[PDB]
Design a protein around this ligand. Structure first.
Ligand SMILES: [Zn+2]
Length: 181
């Protein structure tokens, strides 16, 4: 089921405008029953893709921002309105490892994820992703804050090719990232 979710994330990423500099990524926020869950019981809470929303926005950021907007709060307050049911957990699928730093200085996605766990709200408890960030790691920052994560293998070339489609060095870029496997 995790690979199926990442393929849906890939479809979202394909809506991203290809830019010579951005990484085209898709993200899906899922509410899942604790225990031996049936995917049929999964609920899609929100979705996002790179630059879906005005400005220099990441997939995970748009995912949270879309939900925030529907609930009449800014994204930095999305933790207040996300579901926090006793029998369910929030997990986020994203094609690429969430960023731990952004060159622009904007708040990194790992921090947007971590800050969903505030007050009595459980927040996002696990991230599934398909490729590590190509090129302090986001995954280490998630661990340090108690956010679980898991790499879902098998889709690396496809995720990377979509992500760097707008780049001029895109063939060398994918080959380098696949070499790190
Ligand atoms: Zn990011």
């Amino acid at each position: 089921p995790h690979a199926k979710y990442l393929r849906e994330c890939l479809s979202l990423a394909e809506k991203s405008p290809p830019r010579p500099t951005n990484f085209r990524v898709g993200a899906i926020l899922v509410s899942r029953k604790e225990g031996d869950y049936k995917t049929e019981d999964d609920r899609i809470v929100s979705t996002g893709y790179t630059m879906e929303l005005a400005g220099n926005t990441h997939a995970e950021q748009c995912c949270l921002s879309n939900y925030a907007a529907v609930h009449s709060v800014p994204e930095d307050r999305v933790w207040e309105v996300l579901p926090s049911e006793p029998d369910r957990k929030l997990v986020m699928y994203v094609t690429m490892e969430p960023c731990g730093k952004r060159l622009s200085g904007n708040l990194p996605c790992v921090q947007r994820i971590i800050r969903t766990r505030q007050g009595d709200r459980k927040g996002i408890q696990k991230i599934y992703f398909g490729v590590k960030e190509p090129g302090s790691e986001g995954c280490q920052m998630l661990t340090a804050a108690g956010i679980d994560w898991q790499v879902v293998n098998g889709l690396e070339r496809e995720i990377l090719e979509v992500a760097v489609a707008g780049h001029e060095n895109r063939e060398e870029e994918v080959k380098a990232a696949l070499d790190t496997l």
